[PDB]
Design an enzyme around this catalytic site. Structure first.
Site, PDB file in Angstrom:
ATOM      1  CG  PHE A 123       9.860   5.049  11.388  1.00 25.35           C
ATOM      2  CD1 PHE A 123      11.178   5.153  10.967  1.00 25.35           C
ATOM      3  CD2 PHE A 123       9.354   6.020  12.238  1.00 25.35           C
ATOM      4  CE1 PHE A 123      11.981   6.204  11.391  1.00 25.35           C
ATOM      5  CE2 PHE A 123      10.163   7.057  12.678  1.00 25.35           C
ATOM      6  CZ  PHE A 123      11.465   7.151  12.247  1.00 25.35           C
ATOM      7  N   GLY A 124       8.389   1.904   8.474  1.00 21.05           N
ATOM      8  CA  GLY A 124       7.759   0.659   8.082  1.00 21.05           C
ATOM      9  C   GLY A 124       6.950   0.808   6.802  1.00 21.05           C
ATOM     10  CB  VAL A 168       0.704   0.088   5.221  1.00 23.29           C
ATOM     11  CG1 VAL A 168      -0.696  -0.480   5.347  1.00 23.29           C
ATOM     12  CG2 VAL A 168       1.045   0.927   6.440  1.00 23.29           C
ATOM     13  CG  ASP A 228       2.042  13.508  11.546  1.00 24.07           C
ATOM     14  OD1 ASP A 228       1.773  14.527  10.895  1.00 24.07           O
ATOM     15  OD2 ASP A 228       2.934  12.687  11.196  1.00 24.07           O
ATOM     16  CE  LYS A 256       9.855   2.966   2.200  1.00 24.37           C
ATOM     17  NZ  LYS A 256      10.340   1.977   3.188  1.00 24.37           N
ATOM     18  CB  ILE A 313      -0.951   0.011   1.213  1.00 25.55           C
ATOM     19  CG1 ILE A 313      -2.021  -1.073   1.122  1.00 25.55           C
ATOM     20  CG2 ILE A 313      -1.578   1.394   1.389  1.00 25.55           C
ATOM     21  CD1 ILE A 313      -2.942  -1.138   2.318  1.00 25.55           C
TER      22      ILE A 313
HETATM   23  C1  LIG Z   1      -1.824   0.202  13.264  1.00 25.12           C
HETATM   24  C2  LIG Z   1      -1.875   0.037  11.770  1.00 25.12           C
HETATM   25  C3  LIG Z   1      -1.885  -1.203  11.149  1.00 25.12           C
HETATM   26  C4  LIG Z   1      -1.969  -1.280   9.765  1.00 25.12           C
HETATM   27  C5  LIG Z   1      -2.041  -0.122   9.027  1.00 25.12           C
HETATM   28  C6  LIG Z   1      -2.058   1.095   9.708  1.00 25.12           C
HETATM   29  C7  LIG Z   1      -2.123   2.353   8.970  1.00 25.12           C
HETATM   30  N1  LIG Z   1      -1.322   3.434   9.269  1.00 25.12           N
HETATM   31  C8  LIG Z   1      -1.564   4.409   8.381  1.00 25.12           C
HETATM   32  C9  LIG Z   1      -0.888   5.742   8.433  1.00 25.12           C
HETATM   33  N2  LIG Z   1      -0.799   6.362   7.135  1.00 25.12           N
HETATM   34  C10 LIG Z   1       0.005   5.905   6.133  1.00 25.12           C
HETATM   35  C11 LIG Z   1       0.733   4.714   6.228  1.00 25.12           C
HETATM   36  C12 LIG Z   1       1.537   4.297   5.179  1.00 25.12           C
HETATM   37  C13 LIG Z   1       1.641   5.053   4.038  1.00 25.12           C
HETATM   38  C14 LIG Z   1       0.960   6.245   3.931  1.00 25.12           C
HETATM   39  C15 LIG Z   1       0.160   6.643   4.963  1.00 25.12           C
HETATM   40  F1  LIG Z   1      -0.503   7.823   4.881  1.00 25.12           F
HETATM   41  N3  LIG Z   1      -2.455   4.015   7.483  1.00 25.12           N
HETATM   42  C16 LIG Z   1      -2.797   2.705   7.823  1.00 25.12           C
HETATM   43  C17 LIG Z   1      -3.846   1.997   7.062  1.00 25.12           C
HETATM   44  C18 LIG Z   1      -4.754   1.165   7.749  1.00 25.12           C
HETATM   45  C19 LIG Z   1      -5.771   0.524   7.082  1.00 25.12           C
HETATM   46  C20 LIG Z   1      -5.882   0.681   5.694  1.00 25.12           C
HETATM   47  N4  LIG Z   1      -6.751   0.211   4.801  1.00 25.12           N
HETATM   48  C21 LIG Z   1      -6.333   0.693   3.626  1.00 25.12           C
HETATM   49  N5  LIG Z   1      -5.267   1.474   3.714  1.00 25.12           N
HETATM   50  N6  LIG Z   1      -4.987   1.468   5.047  1.00 25.12           N
HETATM   51  C22 LIG Z   1      -3.971   2.148   5.677  1.00 25.12           C
HETATM   52  N7  LIG Z   1      -1.965   1.167  11.051  1.00 25.12           N
END
Ligand code: A1D6I
Length: 298
Positions: free
Chosen positions: A16-17, A19, A133, A13, A11
């Protein structure tokens, strides 16, 4: 948990880390994966999401923290609900919204922030929490058209008995574009938990502006933009932001169009009342929720 989840699609970054969309017993989940050297970031986000009494329809649904050893290295996992629309940023880029749709996104966001901010007193007590944030990329849109707040990794929790915060905050941790004036110029009193709440409100005001641009009436709407798109570079510095927000004292422009519609007039008034330089003057999340709830009924 992690043993039984299969990663399917990257999906993005975040801070950190990375998704991923994954499958758990056939069901889509989101998985945020960190390396061994990012344990502190992973742990702190896990800690915030495991706060007593945190779950709420407008906070991302947390499933589990876990470790997965692939045979060479260890991965640190957070698992959450998956929302196919993705972020509010993605959603507002792809779609326009109706007046109803706009109010639903704004009200749900404000409701999630009011819940975060609110102390729940009791044996199973929830501390007040500030996000630090908030932005459209960190809010997700559910299939039912409501929002939930994510990336709680930089959050801070308040102890009401002592008026202390659970960590020792650093200055300017979040996204520069959405930083409140008092964060940009470093005048914020970071021993004062209320100051973090007030800074969140400024950011929510910017998110509301992003939503309202996409509210289409009679086929008329503005194009998607980030706040301050008209005044700062992509990926702006603190100094670039400070010159605009603190010194020139500019805020995102409110189009004349938004006066032709009661809902857009109410939204624009909320924005102005989130954008004062002095945090103490800004609306509370609870007051914004009340205003939008009443508008939602009318
Ligand atoms: C605690 C946890 C577990 C899994 C995902 C996230 C999460 N953390 C963010 C923070 N934002 C973020 C992150 C990366 C790249 C770019 C960004 F803006 N998003 C999501 C998320 C959750 C669920 C979902 N379903 C479809 N997308 N998706 C995204 N948190």
């Amino acid at each position: 948990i992690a043993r039984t989840i299969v990663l399917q699609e990257s999906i993005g970054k975040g801070r950190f880390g990375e998704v991923w969309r994954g499958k758990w017993r056939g069901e889509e989940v989101a998985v945020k994966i960190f390396s061994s050297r990012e344990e502190r970031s992973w742990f702190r986000e896990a800690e915030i999401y495991q706060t007593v009494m945190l779950r709420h329809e407008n906070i991302l649904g947390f499933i589990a923290a876990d470790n997965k050893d692939n045979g060479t290295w260890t991965q640190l996992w957070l698992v959450s609900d998956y929302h196919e629309h993705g972020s509010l940023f993605d959603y507002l880029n792809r779609y326009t919204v109706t007046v109803e749709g706009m109010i639903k996104l704004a009200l749900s966001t404000a409701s999630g922030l009011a819940h975060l901010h609110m102390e729940i007193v009791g044996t199973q007590g929830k501390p007040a929490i500030a996000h630090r944030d908030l932005k459209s990329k960190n809010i997700l849109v559910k299939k039912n058209g409501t929002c939930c707040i994510a990336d709680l990794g930089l959050a801070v929790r308040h102890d009401s008995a002592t008026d202390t915060i659970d960590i020792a905050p650093n200055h300017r941790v979040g996204t520069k574009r959405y930083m409140a004036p008092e964060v940009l110029d470093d005048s914020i009193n970071m021993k004062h938990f209320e100051s973090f709440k007030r800074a969140d409100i400024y950011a929510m005001g910017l998110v509301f502006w992003e939503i309202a641009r996409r509210c289409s009436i009679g086929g008329i709407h503005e194009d998607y933009q980030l706040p301050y798109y008209d005044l700062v570079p992509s990926d702006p510095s603190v100094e670039e932001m400070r010159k605009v927000v603190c010194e020139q004292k500019l805020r995102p422009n409110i189009p004349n169009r938004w006066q032709s519609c009661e809902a857009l007039r109410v939204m624009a008034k909320i924005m102005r009342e989130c954008w004062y330089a002095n945090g103490a003057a800004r609306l509370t999340a609870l007051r914004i929720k009340k205003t939008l709830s009443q508008l939602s009924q009318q």
